[PDB]
Design an enzyme around this catalytic site. Structure first.
Site, PDB file in Angstrom:
ATOM      1  N   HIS A 172     -38.876 -12.299 -22.252  1.00  0.00           N
ATOM      2  CA  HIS A 172     -37.785 -11.442 -22.402  1.00  0.00           C
ATOM      3  C   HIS A 172     -36.073 -12.273 -22.800  1.00  0.00           C
ATOM      4  CE1 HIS A 172     -35.554 -15.532 -19.973  1.00  0.00           C
ATOM      5  NE2 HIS A 172     -36.257 -15.422 -19.686  1.00  0.00           N
ATOM      6  N   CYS A 173     -35.503 -11.922 -23.656  1.00  0.00           N
ATOM      7  CA  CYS A 173     -34.369 -12.177 -24.096  1.00  0.00           C
ATOM      8  C   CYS A 173     -32.907 -12.090 -22.795  1.00  0.00           C
ATOM      9  CB  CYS A 173     -33.759 -11.897 -25.246  1.00  0.00           C
ATOM     10  SG  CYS A 173     -33.724 -10.338 -25.709  1.00  0.00           S
ATOM     11  N   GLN A 174     -32.019 -11.424 -23.651  1.00  0.00           N
ATOM     12  CA  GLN A 174     -31.032 -10.853 -22.944  1.00  0.00           C
ATOM     13  C   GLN A 174     -31.041  -9.743 -22.948  1.00  0.00           C
ATOM     14  OE1 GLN A 174     -28.425 -14.450 -25.146  1.00  0.00           O
ATOM     15  NE2 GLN A 174     -27.921 -14.603 -22.519  1.00  0.00           N
ATOM     16  N   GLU A 179     -32.188 -11.421 -19.506  1.00  0.00           N
ATOM     17  CA  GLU A 179     -32.346 -12.752 -18.403  1.00  0.00           C
ATOM     18  C   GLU A 179     -31.729 -12.361 -17.149  1.00  0.00           C
ATOM     19  OE1 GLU A 179     -27.972 -11.648 -20.643  1.00  0.00           O
ATOM     20  OE2 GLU A 179     -28.267 -13.452 -19.569  1.00  0.00           O
TER      21      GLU A 179
END
Ligand SMILES: CC(C)(C)C(=O)CSc1ncc2ccc3ccc(Cl)cc3c2n1
Length: 148
Positions: A88-90, A15
């Site tokens: 992307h994510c977290q 993130e």
């Protein structure tokens, strides 16, 4: 800030990594894949990147296989026109690394184990998810049998 380059055109991050606007333009990234349900598409209103959202959660029931083919074409689109793609994510990059590993299996012809070793070598911190591992294992079965 840390955008991990898996391939010359494919970048992996979390993130916080997706919010570094200066670094993304330095690396010639024009495509972004956001593998979250709730996070915003960072820098969307600036009109600089083409976005795709895979609305997934980091749970042991989430199905990521359904988003595989959609993500592969977005990556090819970035590849075929000379631009970089950031996925992307977290924090744990569990979701985004799963997609990257899947791409290396289908298109770069790597095995599932080797693909994890490849990504883990460049991105040291990857949170475990047995559910995603099971999906990658089942995905390798379909590639070898000519189903997908
Ligand atoms: C799937 C995802 C990337 C989200 C993940 O679970 C990372 S955590 C982890 N920890 C220990 C491992 C030990 C062998 C192994 C063989 C194949 C694969 Cl794909 C993963 C592992 C493995 N993965």
């Amino acid at each position: 800030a840390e955008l991990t380059p898996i391939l010359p055109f494919l970048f992996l991050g979390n993130e916080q990594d997706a919010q570094d606007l200066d670094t993304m333009q330095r690396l010639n990234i024009g495509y972004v894949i956001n593998v979250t349900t709730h996070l915003p598409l960072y820098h969307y209103e600036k009109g600089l990147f083409n976005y795709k959202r895979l609305p997934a959660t980091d749970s042991n029931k989430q199905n990521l296989r359904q988003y595989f083919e959609e993500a592969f074409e977005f990556i090819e689109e970035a590849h075929q026109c000379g631009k970089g793609l950031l996925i992307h994510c977290q924090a744990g990059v569990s979701r985004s690394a799963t997609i990257v590993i899947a791409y290396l299996m289908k298109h770069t012809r790597m095995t599932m184990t080797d693909a994890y070793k490849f990504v883990k070598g460049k991105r040291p911190i990857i949170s475990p998810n047995l559910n995603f591992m099971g999906q990658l294992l089942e995905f390798e079965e379909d590639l070898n049998n000519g189903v997908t």
